[PDB]
Enzyme design. Sequence first.
Site, mmCIF file in Angstrom:
data_model
loop_
_atom_site.group_PDB
_atom_site.id
_atom_site.type_symbol
_atom_site.label_atom_id
_atom_site.label_comp_id
_atom_site.label_asym_id
_atom_site.label_seq_id
_atom_site.Cartn_x
_atom_site.Cartn_y
_atom_site.Cartn_z
ATOM 1 N N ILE A 170 -2.921 -9.122 0.909
ATOM 2 C CA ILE A 170 -3.565 -8.675 2.138
ATOM 3 C C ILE A 170 -2.686 -7.619 2.789
ATOM 4 O O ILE A 170 -1.476 -7.821 2.944
ATOM 5 C CB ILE A 170 -3.813 -9.845 3.105
ATOM 6 C CG1 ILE A 170 -4.527 -10.989 2.384
ATOM 7 C CG2 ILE A 170 -4.636 -9.380 4.296
ATOM 8 C CD1 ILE A 170 -4.776 -12.195 3.255
ATOM 9 N N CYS A 171 -3.295 -6.496 3.167
ATOM 10 C CA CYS A 171 -2.614 -5.458 3.940
ATOM 11 C C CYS A 171 -2.836 -5.764 5.414
ATOM 12 O O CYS A 171 -3.843 -5.377 6.007
ATOM 13 C CB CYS A 171 -3.139 -4.077 3.571
ATOM 14 S SG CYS A 171 -1.983 -3.057 2.636
ATOM 15 N N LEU A 172 -1.882 -6.472 6.015
ATOM 16 C CA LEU A 172 -1.985 -6.899 7.402
ATOM 17 C C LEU A 172 -0.698 -6.563 8.141
ATOM 18 O O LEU A 172 0.397 -6.673 7.582
ATOM 19 C CB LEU A 172 -2.274 -8.401 7.492
ATOM 20 C CG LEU A 172 -2.856 -8.908 8.811
ATOM 21 C CD1 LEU A 172 -4.138 -8.173 9.164
ATOM 22 C CD2 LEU A 172 -3.108 -10.402 8.727
ATOM 23 N N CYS A 221 0.816 -1.210 0.000
ATOM 24 C CA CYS A 221 0.000 0.000 0.000
ATOM 25 C C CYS A 221 0.852 1.262 0.000
ATOM 26 O O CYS A 221 0.393 2.312 -0.460
ATOM 27 C CB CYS A 221 -0.938 -0.002 1.206
ATOM 28 S SG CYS A 221 -0.223 -0.705 2.708
#
Lengths: 985, 147
Positions: free
Chosen positions: B83-85, A580
């Site tokens: 997944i942004c975890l 991100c």
Amino acid sequence: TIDEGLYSRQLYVLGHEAMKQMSQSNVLIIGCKGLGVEIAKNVCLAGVKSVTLYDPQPTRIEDLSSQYFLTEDDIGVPRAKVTVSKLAELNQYVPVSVVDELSTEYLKNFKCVVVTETSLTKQLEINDFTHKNHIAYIAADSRGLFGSIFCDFGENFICTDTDGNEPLTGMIASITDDGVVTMLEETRHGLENGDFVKFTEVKGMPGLNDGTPRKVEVKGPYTFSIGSVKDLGSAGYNGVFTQVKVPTKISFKSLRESLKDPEYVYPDFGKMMRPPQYHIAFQALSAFADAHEGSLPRPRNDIDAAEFFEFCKKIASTLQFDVELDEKLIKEISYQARGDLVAMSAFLGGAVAQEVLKATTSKFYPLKQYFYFDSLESLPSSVTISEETCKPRGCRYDGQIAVFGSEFQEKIASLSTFLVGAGAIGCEMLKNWAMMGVATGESGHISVTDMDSIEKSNLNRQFLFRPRDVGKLKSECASTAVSIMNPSLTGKITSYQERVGPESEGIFGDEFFEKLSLVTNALDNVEARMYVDRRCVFFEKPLLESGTLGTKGNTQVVVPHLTESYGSSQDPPEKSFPICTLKNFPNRIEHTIAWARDLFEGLFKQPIDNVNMYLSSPNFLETSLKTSSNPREVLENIRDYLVTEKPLSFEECIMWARLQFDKFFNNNIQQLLFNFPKDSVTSTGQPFWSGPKRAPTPLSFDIHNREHFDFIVAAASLYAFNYGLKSETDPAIYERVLAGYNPPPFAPKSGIANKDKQELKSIADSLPPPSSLVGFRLTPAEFEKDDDSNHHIDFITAASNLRAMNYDITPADRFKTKFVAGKIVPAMCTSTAVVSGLVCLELVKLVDGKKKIEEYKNGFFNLAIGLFTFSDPIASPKMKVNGKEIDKIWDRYNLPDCTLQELIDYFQKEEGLEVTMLSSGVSLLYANFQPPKKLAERLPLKISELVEQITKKKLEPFRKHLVLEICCDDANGEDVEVPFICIKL
Amino acid sequence: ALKRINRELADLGKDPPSSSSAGPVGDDLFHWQATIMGPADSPYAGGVFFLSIHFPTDYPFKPPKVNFTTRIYHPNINSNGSICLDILRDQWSPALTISKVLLSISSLLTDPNPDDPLVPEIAHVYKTDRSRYELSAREWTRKYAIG
Ligand SMILES: Nc1ncnc2c1ncn2[C@@H]1O[C@H](COP(=O)(O)OP(=O)(O)OP(=O)(O)O)[C@@H](O)[C@H]1O
Ligand SMILES: [Mg+2]
Ligand SMILES: [Mg+2]
């Protein structure tokens, strides 16, 4: 004017200004024996303006003990005249000359003066002139296993960089009006009190952007204080602070003054009472040489030792030294006076060459002033060392025999080593082995493996290669060069071109590995180091690891059944950025560089691969429809690169480059701002584009700007290369073509049967059939940083700078982009020399077969600060198994090829342990939680058949063993660790 | 490495996670095919999501790589299933079991985090038009997460 195609790795250590100042300095070297020639080689590779040699002494046979530029056909000729010709070939920008005689006034022509193999009176006479005229004076000496270095750079030496670390930089959260500065969340500045910093890109306080240094008051690990900033503003938002380093004045003392009151540097803290002994011992050696027509004490002679001790007593009395002489150590120095080793020569040559670079560039902290080193722990003890065995035999190994003796020479000559890699450390190691005479006997042998090819940037620190050798295999060239250095190694060296890994077990099998004596690593990646360590552990072979990083270096020794293995130690992992952060919200230049690399790969590499696979695989589309994550993406890429946007000339490539510019630097930012407006707030009411997130701004294509033009040129050239067209560089064509361009209208979009399948079918039926294009292939762009004409680094730099302009990040030039994108590791020739010297000093311990763990040393050093340290290896952990002592690393179980049930019964009975898990590599052969039917089907099978069935792969004919990992529980149910099983097929 | 993986696998075998079921692919211990059941009080109710887990060589000193396979309409999960975890990048420690990671992913499914998204359009729709986000999530979990 610096040739960045040759000094690419050295510039990342020194810099442009340092090397520019270095290329205007003259170096004189007195003495051209092993130490002198090593210093000259390192200086020539470094890149000084010129080198001058002075050694009128005719060559002798024993002088070949460490001089690798001398041959037995040169006996009777002055060393300088036969060394200049071979030294002049190392670097084409560094002329090398020879002076017949040296007058004092002549010394004014040079910038540094290095003195080796010179008596004390001549050293004093030279220094009395080179001190008051502000000329750097470095004096080195190497007697057996002892060495001394002395540095004197005048009374007003100005040092710019004092530790070799880059200035500390950080991003500021906010600054109050009281000068309190805080980093971002969970970020430590690392500053200390008294430092100076400057602020840039600070919003609300433009005055602080000038850069005037300010005092630093550390108020905590995350905050500090700078003073009062009332006048310039009230509050500063964001910004970046950068440390400012101030020059230091160092005042040296002359040799004559520092003889009486020396200032020492301690290479090891376990023995800090020795340097006062060596200071007396070396002066006594000089006096003894002056008292016997320049003849040093004979090896292992008692009469000469007694006379030397008398001279030591006289010197100690004269100089008012209140130190009690150590008879054993002083007489040891006397015994090895005539010794000449190549490991000590390499170590001291690296150190002294670094000192020369410090003197010329006014960088890093030099030695101040005496540096006395000894590796007396390397002296063998399992052989006979006496006057009878240490006498010279009229051979080239006299300089080594005088220290170790003939029996240890026989031990060395029958080694069977294995060197992995042929980099800089590999070349230095091969040189040391050639000089030491390793594997020159009937039963000796050497094997060297490396799969890379010589490049121009490798010639700066790999001295066994030449510009004419660029493009050839490293191992062959290194073997040929070292055979030329030592003719006795003709046919005793085998050079492979194989990568050491799981797939090379057919060549480096049990037969190959059971004849070795030791393995030496010269690798650069952790994976291969781990694999070689595992192989050595399995076969129980001594291993020698060594690594460098800029000016730092370390060496480790692994001994079977004694110390822990390489894999027992873990190193900090590489840092990977969140997806991100790279995709939408970058805040550093590294993020933009990573994004630019990903853009390059996704533009010029992956679509080309998809098109080629479609034109090669007959059934690619059907497989991609139900296998690829985005079949629509694959179909659109194929359509665009085949029909929709297939260029016909360079103008269409320019048009496509402009379209991609608009698509990646103007439309994506507009969409992102539409999704998250600049005034948007989080769910908690806080502003969105705050802190680690920066608001982007779309770019309008201005042709006159440099960065836009660079990106257009790079993209057009890469696209033309993909389609095999002809690129151009004249700005006229670009300005003409891009003048008549109408940007298609774009507006952000909010979104809001088998039509999708029918859309895919419409794309498919539009694709030309595979048979229509046979032999038409597109060239993918494989990244290559080292080539300057492939438009790769130019494209990455342009894209990174444009994205930095999007997010208001400071752009970086091509130098930093090449350093970051390519993961270039800074490297130096001096560090390589030092690590090779340390490894070869440990090798003689390994040959002698020393058993105690206190006799080995793991070494670490940093040449930017003159730091050397040595610590004992860590002992292998032990454990209790069935009430017995078991080594955790160097123990194994040897079992025949029996059935699984028999193996379980044996472990239940012999070891009193219940087997609960059995695996072979990455396959689960047996477990206690599996269903009964599967176990009953697997129990009566032999281990080899079971492995073949589970892994779905037949065992190779050369396979001779299986390594099984077993987890077994004790009788009480407590898990107990056991060593691995070595099933013998 | 292998011993830790075997311990985790045995722990999973002894205690059925009910909502999860992880196991090695074929017989390879460094490749697992995990199963996650959609939370009841979530738009993904009544859905089965299959995940691919790849353990690193230096496990557990390094976090495993977890990627979705079933398509999901979530702000923090993109088209590739990444997944942004936090517990997979820096908060990972050599003490968390794969069951903990699966529970964390289930919680992330229960309530997304639009403040720091990975797919800006989905997060924007979630923040502006909640009902449309619910409808899209239900449509996706019915088209892909069933059958
Ligand atoms: N698994 C391996 N088996 C054998 N040789 C290897 C292996 N991995 C690396 N090497 C070799 O180790 C050497 C590493 O040396 P070095 O890093 O100094 O050179 P380089 O990587 O070619 O140069 P640079 O890093 O300056 O671009 C190279 O010859 C490389 O081919
Ligand atoms: Mg290379
Ligand atoms: Mg390398």
